[PDB]
Amino acid sequence: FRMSGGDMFVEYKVLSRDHRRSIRVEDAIVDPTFKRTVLPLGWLELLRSPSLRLPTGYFVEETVHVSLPNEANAIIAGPVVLYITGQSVPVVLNPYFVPEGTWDMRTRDGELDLRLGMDAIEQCTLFSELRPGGLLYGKLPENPNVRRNESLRATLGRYGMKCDLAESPLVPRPWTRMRYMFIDELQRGPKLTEFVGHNPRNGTPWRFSQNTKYFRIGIWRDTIRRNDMNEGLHAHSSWQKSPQQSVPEVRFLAPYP
Amino acid sequence: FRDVEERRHSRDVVNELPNPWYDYVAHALPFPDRDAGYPDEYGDLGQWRAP
Amino acid sequence: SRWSSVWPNMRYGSMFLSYSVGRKLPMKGVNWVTRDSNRLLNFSNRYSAVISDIDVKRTEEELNVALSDIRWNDHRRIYWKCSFCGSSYRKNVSVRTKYHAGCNFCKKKYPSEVRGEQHGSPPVSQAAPELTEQLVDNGKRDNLATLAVTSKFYAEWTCRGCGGSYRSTIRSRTGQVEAGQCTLHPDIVAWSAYCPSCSWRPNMVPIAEEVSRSGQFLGLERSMEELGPIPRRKRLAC
Amino acid sequence: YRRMFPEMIGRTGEPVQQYGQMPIWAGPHRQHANKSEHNWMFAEIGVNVGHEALKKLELDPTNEKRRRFVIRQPDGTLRSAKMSEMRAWYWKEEWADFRF
Amino acid sequence: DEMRQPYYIHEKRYGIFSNERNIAKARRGLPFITPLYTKHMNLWDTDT
Amino acid sequence: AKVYGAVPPLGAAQGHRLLHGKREREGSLFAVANDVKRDERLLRQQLNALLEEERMPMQARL
Amino acid sequence: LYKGIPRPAITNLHYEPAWRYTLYQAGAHGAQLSNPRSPFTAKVLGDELMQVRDIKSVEHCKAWFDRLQYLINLHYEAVGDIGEFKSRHTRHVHEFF
Ligand SMILES: [Zn+2]
Ligand SMILES: [Zn+2]
C-alpha cells in the first residue's frame, strides 16, 4: 500500500486453494470501478493445483462475456486465495481470466497493468478506505448517495456530526471505556476451580449452601462446639468454620490472605 | 394382446426410460466385489480394521 | 374369552391408548369440578361454534351430563352433531379445543389433507350443479355444495335406480382429481353413478354391445382406438 | 470458510427420475393392479449390497453395481428413491463435529 | 452378520453354487446337514 | 504491475477448452463411452497418487 | 530352486502388461445407463428425454415453493383471525420453512 498519481498501489500474492502454487504482483492499482478482479488467462493453468478436495484444480470454471475491462470472451475461475501486504485476512476471489485478444494489458515494458476490484476491496481493511474521507472515495462511480466535492466535515455534518470527538461533557471520553484489565498471573493469581456434577464442564462451580437438609445438623454441631473437629457432610457446604468461605473464584495463590 | 400392448407401450414417452430393475443383473457372482467389514484372521470386527 | 385381552389397533391418527393399569391409574386421580372459569358457555366469544355443535338432547339422555356441566377442556366423551355435514359422532371437548378434532367426515372435506385450502378447483355448486339434488337431504345440502369438486369428502347420495341411499366420494362422483394426486379408475364416473348394488346392470351394456358387433370381447378396445413425433433413445441392439 | 471451501456445502444431488414401466400384455384387465393405496418402496439386498462399510460406494451414481431402489407411487408410476429414502436402508448414522 | 465369517467362503472352497446340491439331500437337518466350511481364508490349513 | 514467478507474461497462445471451443466431435456411443471410462479411471489414478503422497512416511521422504 | 515343479506360466502375467485384458466393458453387461448424469447417457437419451426423466423432481421442488408462498400470503400480516377459533401464527410459516 502506497500512494502515487492519486491512486493506491498494493503488493499481493495470488495462490491456489491448497497454497501449492503462488504468484507475486508488485504494484497493482486499487480501482473500485471493477465489479470483479481481472487476471491474464495464462495464469489459470499456472495456479491449478489438483488436490484431494478439488480433483480438478478449481471448484468453479465457466465462461462469461467479461466485456467490462475492454459471447464468452473470458473465464470465471474460483476459488483463488489472495494475500495483500497490509491485511491479516486472506481475500478469496473468483476472478475473470482474460485471454490476450479480449483485453491485452502489456501496457508498459515488463508491466502487466493488473488492478484490484471491489471483489477484493469488500473483504479487507481496504474497505474502510471506501467510506467518506478515505482515499478511494474519489474513485467511487457516481451515485445519488455519494456527493463528489463535499468537504468531509460537511458530509459528516449532514449525517449529524456536530462537534469533535467527545468534546461535549455529556459524552464520556473514549479512553475511560477500559480502565482495569484482568490478568490472573500479574495480580492475585488463578481461581480455585471446583465442580459439583459429572465433570468440570457438566457441573456447576457452586457448592450447596447452608440451607441443605444434610448440612444443618452438622453446621449446628460446628457452631456450638467450635474448637473440636466434627463429622458430617457439612464440610462439603459453601459455608464453613474458617473465615475463608468456599465460593467460586477464590484466589488461593494470592499473598493476602 | 402382445401386439396391442407393444403398440400403446411404444406410443407413450414415459417409457424408453431405462428401468434399473427390469434391465440388468448388477452382480451375478456369489461372492462380493470388495471386502466389507467381516471379521479378520485375528477375529477382530470390521470396525476394528481397515483393509 | 382369551382373545378379549388383545389390544386394539391404533392407527396413525390416534395418540395414547390408556389400556393398561399403569396407563389408567394416574388419570383416575384427577377430579374435575365445573367453576365459572371452566364452563364452556362462558367462553362463547371464542368457542361459539363448538357450543352449537353439541347434541343437547342425546348427551343428557345417554351420558346423564348437563350442558351447563361441560368444561371447555372437558375430558368426557359426549355426543356431537356436525353443523356442517350433519353427521353424529362421539368425542371429548378437550380434543376439539386443544387441536381441532370433530366429525371424521369433515377431515376429508378439502381435496387433500396435506394442503388444506391450496385447491384452485371450483365448488360443486359450479362445476357440477346437477349433483346437489342427488345428495340425501338432511338440510345441509347447501354446505355440501360449497365443497371442492375435487373434494375427497365422503357423502351419501340417493341412488337414481332404486331410490335408496349409498355412500361415495364427491371426487369419485365427478371424476376430477387435482394435478399431482393419484388418478382414479378411468370408469369411476360411470360406476359410482348408482348403488354398489345397482351399478352392475347399466355398465354391462357396452360390453354386450361389443360382443354383439364383433362376436368377440376383449377389454383392449378402448386402448386400441387411442392408437388410431415421439422422441426415442438410441439403442444398443446393433 | 464459505469463500475458501465452497465444496463443503453440498449444492448437488442425484435427481429423482422416473423409471420406464414394463409392458403388461394382459392389457387393461390388469392395469388396475399396480395402482393402489400406498407407496411401495423396494430396496435391494444381496451379497454385494447393504454393507455399511461400503455405503458411499453403493450410493455413488458413478458405480454401476450401485444398490438399486424403486418406488411405486399410488397412481402406478415408478421413480428412483430420494436420497433420504436411500439412506433409510442403512443403520442410523450420527454426525456431529465438535470442532467449531 | 458382522460377527460371523460370511457364507460365500464355503463357495470359494468347494465351488460356486455347490450347496444347492446338498440342500435337496434325503436326510437333512435331522440333526445334521452337509458340513458348512467357513474359516477366514488366511487361516486355511490346506493352502497357507 | 511487476510480476514474479509468472514466467513470460500472458503465457503463450493458450486458450481454454471451453473458451476456444472447437466444434464438438460426434463420437459413436463407442468413442464417448471409452472417453468417459478412460478419463474416469484417469481421475481415480490421480486420487490414488495424491493419497499415496499424503501417507508417505517421513523417512521415505528424506 | 529348480527342483520340485516347473514354474507356472501364469507368472509371466506379472512382468508383461500385454496380458492384462478385460474382454468386456463396464456396463456392456446391460447396465450402461446406470449413471444418470454421465455424458454417455446424455448422448443415448438425448435432452428432451432427460427433461421427461427429471420432470418429477422439478414438480417436487415447485410443490415446496408453492406451499411456502401459500403460507406466506396467508399469515403475512401476523395477527389476524383466519378461521373459527384459529388465528394467524407466523410460527407456522417459520416451521415449514
Ligand atoms: Zn362434518
Ligand atoms: Zn340403488
mmCIF file of C-alpha atoms and ligand atoms in Angstrom, chain C residues 82-87 89 102-107 153, ligand 1:
data_model
loop_
_atom_site.group_PDB
_atom_site.id
_atom_site.type_symbol
_atom_site.label_atom_id
_atom_site.label_comp_id
_atom_site.label_asym_id
_atom_site.label_seq_id
_atom_site.Cartn_x
_atom_site.Cartn_y
_atom_site.Cartn_z
ATOM 1 C CA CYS C 82 -71.772 -31.721 12.907
ATOM 2 C CA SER C 83 -73.176 -28.322 11.926
ATOM 3 C CA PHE C 84 -71.554 -28.591 8.514
ATOM 4 C CA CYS C 85 -72.191 -32.055 7.108
ATOM 5 C CA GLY C 86 -74.731 -33.112 9.743
ATOM 6 C CA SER C 87 -73.228 -36.401 10.967
ATOM 7 C CA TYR C 89 -70.037 -38.658 16.479
ATOM 8 C CA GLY C 102 -64.511 -33.018 15.084
ATOM 9 C CA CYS C 103 -66.593 -35.206 12.796
ATOM 10 C CA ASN C 104 -64.356 -37.656 10.948
ATOM 11 C CA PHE C 105 -66.083 -36.985 7.623
ATOM 12 C CA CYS C 106 -65.136 -33.267 7.594
ATOM 13 C CA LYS C 107 -61.488 -34.322 7.935
ATOM 14 C CA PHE C 153 -65.479 -35.782 1.167
HETATM 15 ZN ZN ZN H 1 -68.838 -32.896 9.355
#
